[PDB]
Amino acid sequence: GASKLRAVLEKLKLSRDDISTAAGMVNGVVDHLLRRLKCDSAFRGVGLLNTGSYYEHVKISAPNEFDVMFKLEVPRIQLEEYSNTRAYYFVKFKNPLSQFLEGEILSASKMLSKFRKIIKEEINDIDVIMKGGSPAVTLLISEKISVDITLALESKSSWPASTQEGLRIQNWLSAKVRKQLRLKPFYLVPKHAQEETWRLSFSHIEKEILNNHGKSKTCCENKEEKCCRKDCLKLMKYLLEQLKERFKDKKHLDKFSSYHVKTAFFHVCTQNPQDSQWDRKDLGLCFDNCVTYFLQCLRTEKLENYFIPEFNLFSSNLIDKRSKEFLTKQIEYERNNEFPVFDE
DNA sequence: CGTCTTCGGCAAT
DNA sequence: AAATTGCCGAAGACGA
Ligand SMILES: Nc1ncnc2c1ncn2[C@@H]1O[C@H](COP(=O)(O)OP(=O)(O)OP(=O)(O)O)[C@@H](O)[C@H]1O
Ligand SMILES: [Mg+2]
Ligand SMILES: [Mg+2]
Ligand SMILES: [Zn+2]
């Protein structure tokens, strides 16, 4: 019901007064931590990269969770793939970060220790409190707003071989745009699989795609070309959020995150490259495409990382089969009854 | 649809 | 020498 879905999206609209107060609190704390980190020899070339739903304009309910990425431009990087995970690597150099070296590989553990320590020493100074390595630190500002701070290495090199067949946007955002996007740097965040591994990150490309998302260059720039891509992502994020809360006493949905929904959404955009396939009048049909695709990923236990096709976010090593069947069962029930979790 | 606010980039310090 | 910063304009809440 497109009429009901529009009512849900109004409920999910952020308060501009809340945005102004929340952004002010986040920026003040983030700018403070950047100034301190820029004073350290190791974090000398640190820079800010705003990531996540808020800066992608797909945050729902309230601006209570922010995601920032503190990126270091590292030089002469040499990646070594860990096992055959296609997404986790060991970092080597072909310098400031010499202190974090353990042998010849860059220690994500050591680098995370100084990162957390410098931030923790600076957070006790401030009405903010600090709480698998990525995000490095989670701040709670005034008991209302949480900010995930992710340490990240910036490599301006060509993307690793595992991403060769990823970012399949040629028939959607154009091969010209895929060439320019893959020219931008890629990022490595400390994530353990072994605690000295780094995981590939493309949150900057995800933000850029979401804010320049149409086949048409003028998509969502005027009233005539308002698509419902972001509305469908919001509805999918809310559906998973309401289900995880409804079944929080059970532990099945604890492994599911909004990134699974966001990754699945990018795949639906590849499957439906035209803006006419995302017309505002067809919000219920477009949302059902996102639901139908997400059910297919659950049932087949296959949800490829949008940038690393061989990395399966729904792998059996990552999520239990009973968790996928449970979420499959609940989504099918929810769809067959006009999504009761939206009313709550 | 005009107004106001925030965010992102990068010449110019 | 290279990190900082002010500013322009899009995105989107908001109302009338
Ligand atoms: N498993 C993952 N693999 C790769 N990148 C991830 C993963 N989880 C999160 N990210 C990156 O971190 C960012 C923030 O993720 P987070 O878990 O905070 O949710 P989100 O995308 O911000 O949406 P919301 O916070 O509203 O649920 C994402 O935009 C994504 O780019
Ligand atoms: Mg977020
Ligand atoms: Mg997070
Ligand atoms: Zn659009």
XYZ file of C-alpha atoms (C1' of nucleotides) and ligand atoms in Angstrom:
407
model
C 0.000 0.000 0.000
C 1.755 3.104 -1.292
C -0.636 5.282 0.719
C 0.402 3.561 3.951
C 4.103 3.589 3.044
C 4.108 7.368 2.590
C 2.658 7.726 6.091
C 5.526 5.645 7.489
C 8.103 7.822 5.718
C 6.618 10.973 7.260
C 7.001 9.321 10.669
C 10.635 8.569 9.771
C 11.392 12.156 8.713
C 14.057 13.782 10.875
C 13.364 16.960 12.829
C 15.394 19.825 11.368
C 15.686 21.261 14.877
C 17.001 17.882 16.039
C 19.423 17.806 13.098
C 20.753 21.273 13.934
C 21.342 20.451 17.605
C 22.679 16.961 16.866
C 25.029 18.066 14.084
C 26.371 20.862 16.276
C 27.166 18.430 19.087
C 28.799 15.917 16.734
C 30.848 18.462 14.779
C 32.211 20.057 17.950
C 33.394 16.730 19.359
C 34.679 15.440 16.010
C 36.600 18.644 15.254
C 38.108 18.474 18.749
C 39.370 14.919 18.244
C 40.766 15.771 14.804
C 42.747 18.718 16.178
C 44.298 16.490 18.851
C 45.036 13.598 16.488
C 46.663 15.935 13.950
C 49.186 16.834 16.667
C 50.501 13.249 16.877
C 53.386 12.108 14.687
C 51.647 8.841 13.791
C 48.237 10.365 12.961
C 49.820 13.308 11.143
C 47.921 13.064 7.858
C 44.591 12.207 9.461
C 41.485 13.532 7.736
C 37.726 13.411 8.148
C 35.469 11.266 5.957
C 31.807 11.391 6.970
C 30.071 8.069 6.295
C 26.850 6.280 7.129
C 23.136 6.879 6.869
C 23.101 10.430 8.251
C 25.496 11.863 5.663
C 23.787 9.709 3.014
C 20.448 11.309 4.022
C 18.855 7.935 4.791
C 18.874 8.181 8.581
C 15.425 7.536 10.046
C 13.458 8.370 13.207
C 16.079 10.638 14.792
C 19.688 11.789 14.197
C 21.007 9.716 17.093
C 23.718 7.640 15.361
C 26.563 9.205 13.376
C 29.389 7.422 11.557
C 32.718 9.158 10.964
C 35.907 7.798 9.427
C 39.321 9.130 10.474
C 41.471 8.390 7.420
C 45.274 8.380 7.246
C 46.911 8.739 3.840
C 49.415 5.885 4.056
C 52.125 5.633 1.374
C 53.651 2.725 -0.550
C 51.070 0.232 0.669
C 51.399 -3.477 -0.139
C 48.343 -5.634 0.530
C 48.475 -9.353 1.298
C 45.179 -11.235 1.237
C 44.372 -13.123 4.436
C 43.458 -16.730 3.532
C 40.924 -16.404 0.663
C 38.466 -14.037 2.347
C 38.803 -11.508 -0.532
C 37.992 -8.697 1.926
C 40.547 -9.036 4.761
C 44.204 -8.189 4.187
C 47.561 -7.716 5.867
C 49.119 -4.270 5.406
C 52.751 -3.876 4.317
C 54.935 -1.032 3.049
C 56.948 -0.763 -0.164
C 57.922 6.510 8.029
C 55.467 7.787 10.674
C 53.648 4.470 11.198
C 56.899 2.563 11.829
C 56.015 2.303 15.531
C 52.948 0.170 14.743
C 54.949 -2.327 12.664
C 54.988 -5.885 14.016
C 57.631 -7.535 11.875
C 56.816 -6.253 8.394
C 53.008 -6.038 8.730
C 51.154 -3.036 10.127
C 49.578 -3.983 13.459
C 45.905 -3.034 13.506
C 45.939 -3.923 17.207
C 48.792 -1.555 18.096
C 47.417 1.211 15.873
C 43.970 0.744 17.415
C 45.452 0.898 20.921
C 47.011 4.336 20.432
C 43.934 5.521 18.525
C 41.578 4.503 21.339
C 43.980 5.822 23.990
C 44.360 9.272 22.419
C 40.595 9.561 21.927
C 39.808 8.225 25.407
C 42.280 10.643 27.002
C 40.533 13.444 25.098
C 36.954 12.321 25.814
C 37.323 12.316 29.606
C 38.400 15.934 29.118
C 35.021 16.815 27.588
C 29.529 15.700 28.482
C 30.710 12.792 26.314
C 31.720 9.240 27.256
C 33.563 6.536 25.321
C 32.203 3.007 24.954
C 35.614 -6.218 16.328
C 37.913 -3.217 16.226
C 35.908 -1.319 13.590
C 34.295 0.996 14.669
C 37.317 1.750 16.849
C 35.491 3.982 19.345
C 31.821 4.684 20.043
C 30.973 7.985 21.730
C 27.738 8.748 23.583
C 27.050 12.493 23.533
C 24.672 13.710 26.259
C 23.101 10.216 26.496
C 21.186 11.011 23.272
C 23.583 10.699 20.318
C 26.044 7.909 19.503
C 28.999 8.465 17.160
C 30.964 5.571 15.657
C 34.583 6.557 14.963
C 36.405 4.271 12.531
C 40.155 4.264 12.011
C 40.974 3.921 8.326
C 44.008 3.791 6.067
C 43.757 5.639 2.754
C 45.432 4.018 -0.255
C 45.308 5.999 -3.494
C 46.484 2.871 -5.332
C 44.320 0.869 -7.704
C 41.641 -1.190 -6.000
C 42.586 -4.767 -5.026
C 41.903 -7.618 -7.426
C 38.907 -8.816 -5.390
C 36.976 -5.689 -6.446
C 37.641 -6.223 -10.169
C 34.130 -7.557 -10.840
C 32.393 -5.427 -8.196
C 30.663 -2.044 -8.324
C 28.551 -3.167 -11.279
C 27.004 0.220 -12.060
C 27.784 0.370 -15.793
C 24.180 0.084 -16.980
C 22.973 2.252 -14.062
C 25.387 5.086 -13.194
C 27.414 4.536 -16.439
C 30.809 3.036 -17.234
C 32.216 6.577 -17.232
C 31.184 6.995 -13.585
C 32.518 3.567 -12.606
C 35.890 4.550 -14.071
C 36.016 7.780 -12.047
C 34.780 6.120 -8.845
C 37.394 3.363 -9.045
C 40.028 6.094 -9.482
C 39.293 7.419 -5.984
C 41.194 5.825 -3.078
C 40.022 2.783 -1.157
C 40.091 2.386 2.605
C 41.198 -0.267 5.087
C 39.664 -0.442 8.562
C 40.943 -2.575 11.476
C 38.592 -5.569 11.553
C 39.554 -9.020 12.803
C 38.459 -12.199 11.042
C 43.345 -13.219 13.621
C 43.395 -9.642 14.937
C 46.025 -8.093 12.621
C 43.718 -8.013 9.579
C 42.261 -4.960 7.850
C 38.991 -4.958 5.903
C 38.291 -3.031 2.709
C 35.978 -0.041 3.075
C 34.148 1.901 0.360
C 31.822 4.009 2.501
C 32.824 7.102 0.519
C 31.684 5.421 -2.703
C 28.447 4.345 -1.010
C 27.810 7.938 0.076
C 28.623 9.296 -3.385
C 26.375 6.747 -5.105
C 23.438 7.470 -2.798
C 23.695 11.251 -3.298
C 24.136 10.871 -7.107
C 21.947 7.831 -7.629
C 19.971 8.265 -10.850
C 20.355 7.187 -14.437
C 19.448 10.784 -15.255
C 21.941 13.401 -14.106
C 19.002 15.542 -12.909
C 17.416 12.789 -10.802
C 15.786 14.208 -7.641
C 16.899 17.725 -8.639
C 13.369 18.841 -9.596
C 9.783 17.858 -8.844
C 9.399 16.063 -12.184
C 12.297 13.665 -11.477
C 11.737 12.675 -7.833
C 12.475 8.959 -7.495
C 11.817 6.754 -4.462
C 15.216 5.033 -4.202
C 16.078 6.596 -0.840
C 12.514 6.106 0.411
C 12.777 2.380 -0.307
C 16.089 2.161 1.552
C 14.551 3.994 4.519
C 11.609 1.575 4.547
C 13.940 -1.432 4.406
C 16.070 -0.027 7.235
C 12.933 0.593 9.296
C 11.568 -2.890 8.566
C 14.733 -4.529 9.897
C 14.918 -2.102 12.826
C 11.324 -2.825 13.843
C 11.823 -6.585 13.489
C 15.034 -6.647 15.544
C 13.237 -4.705 18.288
C 10.097 -6.858 18.100
C 12.209 -10.022 18.500
C 14.999 -8.653 20.704
C 14.309 -11.284 23.375
C 15.294 -13.912 20.823
C 18.840 -13.776 19.463
C 18.191 -14.618 15.797
C 18.217 -11.083 14.366
C 21.295 -9.970 16.342
C 23.574 -10.793 13.400
C 21.538 -8.763 10.897
C 22.557 -5.134 10.383
C 21.378 -2.229 8.254
C 24.425 -2.722 6.015
C 22.865 -5.987 4.830
C 19.793 -3.966 3.844
C 21.916 -1.224 2.271
C 24.031 -3.713 0.308
C 20.874 -5.452 -0.911
C 19.469 -2.062 -1.929
C 22.497 -1.320 -4.119
C 21.939 -4.665 -5.854
C 18.285 -3.810 -6.518
C 19.473 -0.551 -8.086
C 21.712 -2.559 -10.419
C 18.758 -4.804 -11.276
C 16.581 -1.711 -11.909
C 18.926 0.848 -13.483
C 16.291 3.205 -14.919
C 14.731 6.062 -12.962
C 11.369 5.061 -14.451
C 11.796 1.810 -12.489
C 11.910 3.970 -9.328
C 8.963 6.277 -10.014
C 7.397 7.894 -6.958
C 3.948 6.597 -7.944
C 5.294 3.021 -7.728
C 6.641 3.258 -4.164
C 4.824 0.091 -3.102
C 6.091 -1.824 -6.129
C 9.647 -0.537 -5.696
C 9.630 -1.360 -1.983
C 8.408 -4.869 -2.783
C 11.328 -5.272 -5.191
C 13.664 -4.517 -2.282
C 11.760 -6.938 -0.043
C 11.659 -9.649 -2.717
C 15.386 -9.349 -3.412
C 16.245 -9.406 0.294
C 14.168 -12.560 0.758
C 16.072 -14.174 -2.120
C 19.364 -13.398 -0.371
C 18.093 -14.879 2.901
C 16.710 -18.033 1.284
C 19.768 -18.690 -0.900
C 22.202 -17.537 1.835
C 23.931 -15.284 -0.710
C 24.356 -11.508 -0.381
C 27.479 -10.300 -2.169
C 29.412 -7.316 -0.885
C 28.607 -4.684 -3.500
C 32.328 -4.005 -4.046
C 33.713 -7.510 -3.397
C 31.511 -10.071 -5.185
C 33.239 -13.147 -3.721
C 32.592 -11.956 -0.140
C 29.232 -13.352 1.000
C 27.733 -11.353 3.868
C 25.163 -14.144 4.341
C 27.821 -16.869 4.546
C 27.185 -19.734 6.950
C 30.352 -18.798 8.855
C 28.854 -15.347 9.564
C 25.112 -15.923 10.150
C 23.281 -19.057 11.273
C 20.793 -20.715 8.932
C 18.086 -20.552 11.607
C 18.590 -16.783 11.825
C 18.080 -16.405 8.071
C 15.039 -18.696 8.072
C 13.587 -16.786 11.032
C 13.968 -13.410 9.319
C 12.674 -14.958 6.091
C 9.605 -16.221 7.954
C 8.903 -12.899 9.680
C 9.353 -10.764 6.554
C 6.979 -13.006 4.611
C 4.407 -12.736 7.401
C 4.951 -8.978 7.602
C 4.460 -8.576 3.849
C 1.286 -10.692 3.828
C -0.321 -8.458 6.501
C 0.524 -4.937 5.246
C 3.636 -4.775 7.475
C 2.201 -4.523 11.014
C 5.610 -3.638 12.509
C 5.310 -0.213 10.870
C 2.284 0.659 13.012
C 3.827 -0.838 16.178
C 7.765 26.556 -4.109
C 10.414 29.831 -1.311
C 13.341 29.803 3.092
C 16.613 28.070 6.012
C 20.023 24.791 7.590
C 23.803 21.513 6.984
C 27.354 19.312 4.272
C 31.342 18.723 0.826
C 35.119 20.323 -1.822
C 39.141 23.025 -2.823
C 41.326 27.874 -4.145
C 43.352 30.712 -1.280
C 45.757 31.786 2.540
C 55.649 23.205 2.498
C 51.272 21.472 3.076
C 47.586 21.689 6.246
C 43.606 25.208 7.072
C 39.514 27.653 6.060
C 35.902 30.453 4.071
C 32.428 30.136 0.726
C 29.334 28.575 -2.985
C 25.463 25.669 -4.010
C 22.882 21.123 -3.533
C 19.876 18.329 -0.307
C 16.099 18.313 2.359
C 13.045 19.785 6.436
C 9.367 23.164 6.852
C 5.326 26.103 6.077
C 2.158 29.001 3.777
N 29.847 -5.200 7.501
C 30.256 -4.077 6.863
N 31.067 -4.137 5.785
C 31.477 -3.028 5.142
N 31.128 -1.783 5.507
C 30.319 -1.576 6.572
C 29.826 -2.738 7.327
N 29.054 -2.260 8.320
C 29.051 -0.909 8.211
N 29.805 -0.499 7.172
C 30.014 0.911 6.768
O 29.815 1.754 7.906
C 28.773 2.702 7.659
C 27.922 2.900 8.903
O 27.291 1.664 9.227
P 26.238 1.546 10.440
O 26.338 0.128 10.953
O 26.440 2.717 11.374
O 24.792 1.701 9.741
P 24.413 2.872 8.698
O 24.742 2.420 7.293
O 24.972 4.172 9.219
O 22.808 2.929 8.843
P 22.128 3.155 10.287
O 23.278 3.599 11.159
O 21.071 4.212 10.058
O 21.583 1.792 10.639
C 27.962 2.137 6.508
O 27.444 3.177 5.676
C 28.947 1.275 5.751
O 29.539 2.041 4.699
Mg 24.818 5.242 10.952
Mg 28.141 1.814 12.967
Zn 16.410 10.135 -7.553
